[PDB]
């Protein structure tokens, strides 16, 4: 099947929720090591348009 | 993508803020407080891997156009194409002469530049785009030409080889690989006739002028830099819309500064008043072919002609195929557009003659102990 236009909305909020929070969190190597792959995977799933 | 790119551009001005602080402290007033330590780590450890992977997956989306769709579906808008162009220009200017300041993050920066270059739809940006965005792309080529000119004049042993060290390590690690990738991207998508038009041509001419000027130079640094310089020059020849090796037929080329611009102009900006004088130290195609043929038949080894094999041959191996399709003997759909005579004289004879000379060059060095240029020559031919 295909996404239902609601999972994409959840995915879009999930991306920016992590991105905004990580942009203010103090640098933690363990946190950054596994948050970055999550952002790449989420960004690679959302359609650009 | 519009929101994601806008945030990336928002961090670009932030990136410019602390690198200047790093440049300031590394010059005077040493302090290890690093007020932007969070910003530096987030930019280097999150943004660069994110830019690296995002545009690798969605490369076709930004290169697509409503006329020709390349990806599965959808195409980037003009504003998105403008933003990704400004992202490349800002990132390139960020690392310019600051490769050392990034430490181990410099390989990440150049990898992002490679991927951003492969996703630049420069045809639409240069044709229908804002002046600010277009001026950024023009400034990149102009800055690249100036850096290469400083590099080649230092390889001329003007300095022993301050800023000489910074310029040399920036060009050989960042500028040359990125410029090679950008020219290759332009050549594959036939963007040369739309991007390198008025001032990019002048910038590309100076790059073409300077790189070939290493033939009369014999040093240790030049020896190891020939494969990088030769590959960059070969890609430039594929993307150059002017037949710089055949100036006698330049009057029939529409994509030339001497035809697009009036004689009243081209004087406010310094031009040599003649197409033949743009890069006068480059031999014409007829002369260049004769020199290679003479070397091939003379049985000369690689040691007595390193410039021809490493630089001149890759240039011709890319110049001739481009202009064979735009000159005589091409399969011309030119019933309506056949009035302008071809601006080049490249036929199948030139390609056949060059290939025969290349084969004779290889067999002259067939039994030598060490020759690492053979693999590079094979892929170019």
Coordinates of C-alpha atoms in Angstrom, one line a residue:
Chain A
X1 CA 0.0 0.0 0.0
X2 CA 0.8 3.7 0.2
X3 CA 0.8 6.2 3.1
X4 CA -2.5 7.7 4.1
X5 CA -1.5 11.4 4.2
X6 CA -1.6 11.2 8.0
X7 CA 1.5 9.0 8.5
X8 CA 3.4 11.6 6.4
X9 CA 2.1 14.3 8.8
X10 CA 3.3 12.3 11.7
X11 CA 6.6 11.7 10.0
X12 CA 7.0 15.4 9.2
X13 CA 6.4 16.3 12.8
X14 CA 8.8 13.6 13.9
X15 CA 11.5 15.0 11.7
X16 CA 11.2 18.6 12.9
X17 CA 10.6 17.5 16.5
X18 CA 14.0 15.7 16.6
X19 CA 15.7 18.4 14.5
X20 CA 14.6 21.3 16.7
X21 CA 15.3 19.5 19.9
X22 CA 18.7 18.3 18.7
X23 CA 19.6 21.9 17.6
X24 CA 19.3 23.1 21.2
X25 CA 20.6 20.0 23.1
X26 CA 24.2 20.3 24.3
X27 CA 26.6 18.1 22.4
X28 CA 26.4 14.4 23.5
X29 CA 28.3 12.0 21.4
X30 CA 26.0 9.0 22.2
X31 CA 22.9 11.1 21.4
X32 CA 24.3 12.5 18.2
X33 CA 25.6 9.1 17.1
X34 CA 22.0 7.6 16.8
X35 CA 19.9 10.7 16.3
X36 CA 21.6 11.5 13.0
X37 CA 20.7 8.2 11.3
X38 CA 17.1 8.6 12.4
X39 CA 17.0 12.0 10.7
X40 CA 18.5 10.7 7.5
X41 CA 16.1 7.8 7.4
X42 CA 13.1 10.0 8.1
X43 CA 14.1 12.6 5.5
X44 CA 14.7 9.8 3.0
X45 CA 11.2 8.6 3.4
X46 CA 9.2 11.8 3.2
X47 CA 8.5 12.9 -0.4
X48 CA 10.4 16.2 -1.2
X49 CA 7.2 17.8 -2.5
Chain B
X1 CA 12.1 20.2 0.7
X2 CA 11.3 24.0 0.7
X3 CA 11.2 24.1 4.5
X4 CA 14.2 21.8 4.9
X5 CA 16.3 23.8 2.4
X6 CA 15.3 27.1 4.1
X7 CA 16.5 25.8 7.5
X8 CA 19.8 24.7 5.9
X9 CA 20.3 28.2 4.4
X10 CA 19.4 29.6 7.9
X11 CA 22.2 27.6 9.4
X12 CA 24.6 28.8 6.6
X13 CA 24.5 32.3 7.9
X14 CA 25.0 30.9 11.3
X15 CA 28.0 28.8 10.0
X16 CA 29.5 32.0 8.6
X17 CA 29.2 33.6 12.0
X18 CA 31.4 31.3 14.0
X19 CA 34.0 30.5 11.3
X20 CA 34.8 34.2 11.3
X21 CA 35.1 34.0 15.1
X22 CA 37.4 30.9 14.7
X23 CA 39.4 32.9 12.1
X24 CA 39.6 35.8 14.5
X25 CA 40.8 33.8 17.5
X26 CA 43.2 31.8 15.4
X27 CA 44.8 35.1 14.2
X28 CA 44.7 37.2 17.5
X29 CA 43.3 36.9 21.0
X30 CA 43.5 33.2 21.6
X31 CA 40.6 31.8 23.7
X32 CA 39.3 28.3 24.0
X33 CA 35.8 29.2 25.4
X34 CA 34.2 28.4 22.0
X35 CA 30.9 30.2 22.5
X36 CA 29.5 28.4 19.4
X37 CA 30.7 24.9 20.4
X38 CA 27.1 23.6 20.1
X39 CA 26.7 25.2 16.7
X40 CA 30.0 23.8 15.4
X41 CA 29.2 20.2 16.5
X42 CA 25.6 20.3 15.2
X43 CA 26.7 21.7 11.9
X44 CA 29.6 19.2 11.5
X45 CA 28.0 16.1 13.0
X46 CA 24.4 16.4 11.9
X47 CA 23.9 18.8 9.0
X48 CA 26.8 17.5 6.9
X49 CA 25.7 13.8 7.1
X50 CA 22.1 15.0 6.6
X51 CA 22.9 17.0 3.5
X52 CA 25.1 14.2 2.2
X53 CA 22.4 11.6 2.4
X54 CA 19.3 13.7 1.6
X55 CA 20.5 15.0 -1.8
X56 CA 21.9 11.6 -2.7
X57 CA 18.4 10.0 -2.4
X58 CA 16.5 13.0 -3.9
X59 CA 19.0 13.9 -6.6
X60 CA 16.6 13.3 -9.5
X61 CA 13.9 15.4 -7.8
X62 CA 15.9 18.6 -8.0
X63 CA 17.3 17.8 -11.5
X64 CA 13.8 17.1 -12.9
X65 CA 11.9 19.7 -14.9
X66 CA 8.3 19.7 -16.1
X67 CA 9.6 19.4 -19.7
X68 CA 11.6 16.3 -18.8
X69 CA 10.9 14.3 -15.6
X70 CA 13.8 12.1 -14.4
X71 CA 12.6 10.8 -11.0
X72 CA 9.7 8.6 -10.1
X73 CA 7.4 11.6 -9.7
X74 CA 7.4 15.3 -9.0
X75 CA 9.9 17.9 -9.8
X76 CA 11.5 20.7 -7.8
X77 CA 10.1 24.2 -8.2
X78 CA 12.3 27.1 -9.3
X79 CA 12.7 28.5 -5.8
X80 CA 13.9 25.1 -4.6
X81 CA 16.4 25.0 -7.4
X82 CA 17.5 28.5 -6.5
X83 CA 17.9 27.6 -2.8
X84 CA 20.0 24.5 -3.5
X85 CA 22.2 26.6 -5.8
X86 CA 22.7 29.2 -3.0
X87 CA 23.4 26.4 -0.6
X88 CA 26.2 25.2 -2.8
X89 CA 27.7 28.6 -3.2
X90 CA 27.5 29.5 0.5
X91 CA 29.0 26.1 1.5
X92 CA 31.8 26.5 -1.1
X93 CA 32.6 30.0 0.1
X94 CA 32.5 28.7 3.7
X95 CA 35.3 26.2 3.1
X96 CA 37.3 28.5 0.8
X97 CA 40.8 28.8 2.4
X98 CA 39.5 27.4 5.6
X99 CA 40.0 23.6 5.0
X100 CA 42.4 23.4 8.0
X101 CA 39.9 25.1 10.4
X102 CA 37.4 22.2 9.8
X103 CA 39.9 19.6 11.0
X104 CA 38.6 16.1 10.4
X105 CA 35.3 17.6 9.1
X106 CA 36.9 18.8 5.9
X107 CA 36.3 15.5 4.1
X108 CA 32.6 15.7 5.1
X109 CA 32.4 19.3 3.7
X110 CA 33.9 18.4 0.3
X111 CA 31.6 15.3 0.0
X112 CA 28.6 17.5 0.5
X113 CA 29.9 19.8 -2.2
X114 CA 30.2 16.9 -4.6
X115 CA 26.6 15.8 -4.0
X116 CA 25.3 19.3 -4.1
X117 CA 27.1 19.8 -7.4
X118 CA 25.5 16.7 -8.9
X119 CA 22.0 18.1 -7.9
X120 CA 22.4 21.6 -9.5
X121 CA 19.9 22.3 -12.2
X122 CA 22.0 25.3 -13.2
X123 CA 20.2 25.6 -16.6
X124 CA 16.9 26.9 -15.0
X125 CA 18.7 29.0 -12.4
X126 CA 20.9 30.9 -14.9
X127 CA 18.1 31.3 -17.4
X128 CA 15.1 32.3 -15.1
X129 CA 16.5 33.1 -11.7
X130 CA 17.1 35.9 -9.2
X131 CA 20.2 38.1 -9.7
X132 CA 21.4 37.4 -6.2
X133 CA 21.4 33.6 -6.7
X134 CA 22.9 33.9 -10.2
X135 CA 25.6 36.2 -8.9
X136 CA 26.6 33.6 -6.3
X137 CA 27.2 31.0 -8.9
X138 CA 29.2 33.4 -11.0
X139 CA 31.3 34.4 -8.0
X140 CA 32.1 30.7 -7.4
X141 CA 33.7 30.3 -10.9
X142 CA 35.4 33.6 -10.6
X143 CA 36.8 32.7 -7.2
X144 CA 37.9 29.3 -8.5
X145 CA 39.8 30.9 -11.4
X146 CA 41.6 33.2 -9.0
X147 CA 42.6 30.4 -6.6
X148 CA 43.9 28.2 -9.5
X149 CA 45.9 31.2 -10.9
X150 CA 47.5 31.7 -7.5
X151 CA 48.2 27.9 -7.3
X152 CA 49.8 27.6 -10.8
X153 CA 52.0 30.7 -10.2
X154 CA 53.2 29.2 -7.0
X155 CA 53.9 25.9 -8.8
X156 CA 55.9 28.1 -11.1
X157 CA 58.3 28.4 -8.2
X158 CA 57.5 32.0 -7.6
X159 CA 57.4 30.9 -4.0
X160 CA 59.2 27.9 -2.4
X161 CA 56.0 26.3 -1.1
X162 CA 51.6 32.0 4.9
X163 CA 48.6 32.0 2.5
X164 CA 50.6 29.9 -0.1
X165 CA 50.2 26.8 2.1
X166 CA 46.5 27.6 2.7
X167 CA 45.8 28.1 -1.0
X168 CA 47.7 25.1 -2.1
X169 CA 46.0 22.7 0.3
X170 CA 42.5 24.2 -0.4
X171 CA 42.8 23.8 -4.1
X172 CA 44.2 20.3 -4.2
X173 CA 41.8 18.9 -1.6
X174 CA 38.6 20.9 -2.1
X175 CA 38.5 23.2 -5.1
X176 CA 39.9 20.8 -7.8
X177 CA 37.7 17.7 -6.9
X178 CA 34.6 19.9 -6.6
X179 CA 35.3 21.8 -9.8
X180 CA 35.9 18.6 -11.7
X181 CA 32.6 17.2 -10.4
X182 CA 30.7 20.4 -11.3
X183 CA 32.0 20.4 -14.9
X184 CA 31.2 16.7 -15.3
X185 CA 27.7 17.4 -14.1
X186 CA 27.3 20.2 -16.6
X187 CA 28.7 18.1 -19.4
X188 CA 26.4 15.1 -18.8
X189 CA 23.2 17.2 -18.7
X190 CA 24.3 19.5 -21.6
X191 CA 24.2 22.6 -19.4
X192 CA 27.3 24.1 -21.0
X193 CA 25.4 26.1 -23.6
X194 CA 23.2 27.7 -20.9
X195 CA 25.5 28.2 -17.9
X196 CA 29.0 29.1 -19.3
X197 CA 27.8 32.1 -21.3
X198 CA 29.2 35.6 -20.4
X199 CA 31.4 35.8 -17.3
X200 CA 31.6 32.0 -16.5
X201 CA 33.3 31.8 -19.9
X202 CA 35.9 34.4 -18.9
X203 CA 36.4 32.5 -15.6
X204 CA 36.6 29.2 -17.4
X205 CA 39.0 30.6 -20.0
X206 CA 41.4 31.7 -17.2
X207 CA 41.1 28.2 -15.7
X208 CA 41.8 26.8 -19.1
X209 CA 44.6 29.3 -19.6
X210 CA 46.3 28.5 -16.3
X211 CA 46.0 24.7 -16.1
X212 CA 47.6 24.2 -19.5
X213 CA 50.4 26.6 -18.6
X214 CA 52.0 23.8 -16.5
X215 CA 53.7 22.3 -19.6
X216 CA 56.8 24.5 -19.2
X217 CA 57.0 23.6 -15.5
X218 CA 59.2 20.9 -14.0
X219 CA 58.9 20.4 -10.2
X220 CA 57.9 17.7 -7.7
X221 CA 54.6 19.3 -6.7
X222 CA 53.6 19.5 -10.4
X223 CA 54.4 15.9 -11.0
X224 CA 51.9 14.6 -8.4
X225 CA 49.2 17.2 -9.4
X226 CA 49.0 16.3 -13.1
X227 CA 46.4 13.6 -12.7
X228 CA 44.1 16.0 -10.8
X229 CA 44.8 18.9 -13.2
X230 CA 44.3 16.7 -16.2
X231 CA 41.0 15.3 -15.1
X232 CA 39.7 18.8 -14.3
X233 CA 40.8 20.1 -17.7
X234 CA 39.2 17.1 -19.5
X235 CA 35.8 17.8 -17.8
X236 CA 36.1 21.5 -18.6
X237 CA 36.6 20.7 -22.3
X238 CA 33.4 18.6 -22.3
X239 CA 31.4 21.5 -20.7
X240 CA 33.0 24.4 -22.5
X241 CA 30.6 25.7 -25.1
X242 CA 33.3 27.4 -27.2
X243 CA 35.8 25.7 -29.5
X244 CA 38.8 27.2 -27.8
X245 CA 41.1 25.0 -30.0
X246 CA 39.6 26.4 -33.2
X247 CA 39.4 30.2 -32.8
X248 CA 39.3 30.7 -36.6
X249 CA 35.6 29.5 -36.6
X250 CA 34.5 31.2 -33.5
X251 CA 32.4 33.7 -35.5
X252 CA 29.9 30.9 -36.2
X253 CA 29.4 30.0 -32.5
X254 CA 26.3 31.6 -30.8
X255 CA 27.4 30.7 -27.3
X256 CA 30.5 32.9 -27.3
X257 CA 31.1 36.2 -25.6
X258 CA 32.4 37.8 -28.8
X259 CA 28.9 37.2 -30.4
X260 CA 26.6 37.6 -27.4
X261 CA 28.2 40.9 -26.3
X262 CA 28.7 44.1 -28.3
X263 CA 32.1 45.5 -29.3
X264 CA 31.1 48.5 -27.2
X265 CA 31.2 46.2 -24.2
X266 CA 33.9 43.5 -23.7
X267 CA 36.0 46.7 -23.2
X268 CA 34.5 47.8 -19.9
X269 CA 35.5 44.3 -18.7
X270 CA 39.1 43.5 -19.8
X271 CA 39.0 41.3 -22.9
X272 CA 41.9 41.0 -25.4
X273 CA 39.7 42.3 -28.3
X274 CA 40.1 39.0 -30.2
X275 CA 39.0 35.4 -29.6
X276 CA 42.5 34.1 -30.6
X277 CA 44.0 36.1 -27.7
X278 CA 41.8 34.7 -24.9
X279 CA 44.3 31.8 -24.3
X280 CA 47.0 32.4 -26.8
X281 CA 49.4 29.8 -25.3
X282 CA 47.0 27.0 -26.2
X283 CA 48.0 25.4 -29.6
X284 CA 45.3 25.2 -32.2
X285 CA 43.7 21.8 -32.9
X286 CA 45.7 21.2 -36.1
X287 CA 49.0 22.0 -34.3
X288 CA 48.1 20.0 -31.3
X289 CA 47.3 16.9 -33.3
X290 CA 50.6 17.2 -35.3
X291 CA 52.6 17.4 -32.1
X292 CA 51.0 14.3 -30.6
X293 CA 51.5 12.4 -33.9
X294 CA 55.1 13.4 -34.0
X295 CA 55.7 12.2 -30.5
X296 CA 53.9 8.9 -31.1
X297 CA 55.9 8.1 -34.2
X298 CA 59.2 9.2 -32.7
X299 CA 58.9 6.5 -30.0
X300 CA 59.2 8.9 -27.1
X301 CA 58.8 7.5 -23.7
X302 CA 56.5 8.9 -20.9
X303 CA 59.5 10.7 -19.2
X304 CA 60.1 13.1 -22.1
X305 CA 56.4 14.0 -22.6
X306 CA 54.5 13.9 -19.2
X307 CA 52.5 17.0 -19.9
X308 CA 51.0 15.6 -23.2
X309 CA 49.9 12.3 -21.7
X310 CA 48.6 13.6 -18.4
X311 CA 47.0 16.9 -19.6
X312 CA 46.9 17.3 -23.4
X313 CA 45.6 13.9 -24.2
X314 CA 42.7 13.9 -21.7
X315 CA 41.7 17.3 -23.1
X316 CA 41.5 16.1 -26.7
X317 CA 39.9 12.8 -25.6
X318 CA 37.0 15.0 -24.4
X319 CA 37.2 18.0 -26.7
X320 CA 36.9 16.0 -30.0
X321 CA 33.8 13.8 -29.0
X322 CA 31.9 17.0 -28.0
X323 CA 32.5 18.9 -31.2
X324 CA 32.1 15.9 -33.5
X325 CA 28.4 16.0 -32.8
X326 CA 28.2 19.8 -33.5
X327 CA 30.3 20.0 -36.7
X328 CA 30.6 18.3 -40.1
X329 CA 29.9 14.6 -40.4
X330 CA 27.4 14.9 -37.5
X331 CA 23.9 13.3 -38.1
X332 CA 22.3 16.7 -38.6
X333 CA 18.7 17.5 -38.0
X334 CA 19.5 20.9 -39.5
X335 CA 17.0 21.4 -42.2
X336 CA 15.7 24.5 -40.4
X337 CA 18.9 25.4 -38.5
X338 CA 21.5 24.5 -41.1
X339 CA 22.1 28.1 -42.2
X340 CA 24.8 28.8 -39.7
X341 CA 28.0 27.0 -40.7
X342 CA 29.5 24.7 -38.0
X343 CA 31.8 26.4 -35.5
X344 CA 34.2 23.4 -35.5
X345 CA 36.0 21.3 -38.1
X346 CA 36.2 18.0 -36.1
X347 CA 35.4 14.9 -38.2
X348 CA 35.9 11.2 -37.7
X349 CA 39.4 11.6 -39.1
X350 CA 40.5 13.6 -36.0
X351 CA 39.2 10.9 -33.6
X352 CA 40.6 8.1 -35.7
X353 CA 44.0 9.8 -35.9
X354 CA 44.1 10.6 -32.2
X355 CA 43.2 7.0 -31.3
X356 CA 45.9 5.6 -33.5
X357 CA 48.5 7.9 -31.9
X358 CA 47.3 6.9 -28.4
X359 CA 47.8 3.2 -29.2
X360 CA 51.3 3.9 -30.5
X361 CA 52.1 5.9 -27.3
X362 CA 51.1 3.0 -25.1
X363 CA 53.3 0.4 -27.0
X364 CA 56.3 2.8 -26.8
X365 CA 56.0 2.4 -23.0
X366 CA 54.8 -1.2 -23.1
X367 CA 57.8 -2.8 -21.4
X368 CA 58.7 -0.1 -18.9
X369 CA 58.9 -1.0 -15.2
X370 CA 56.4 1.6 -13.8
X371 CA 53.6 3.4 -15.5
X372 CA 50.6 4.5 -13.5
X373 CA 49.3 6.8 -16.2
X374 CA 48.1 3.9 -18.4
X375 CA 44.9 3.3 -16.4
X376 CA 44.1 7.0 -16.5
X377 CA 44.7 7.2 -20.2
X378 CA 42.6 4.1 -20.9
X379 CA 39.5 5.6 -19.3
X380 CA 39.9 8.9 -21.1
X381 CA 40.4 7.3 -24.5

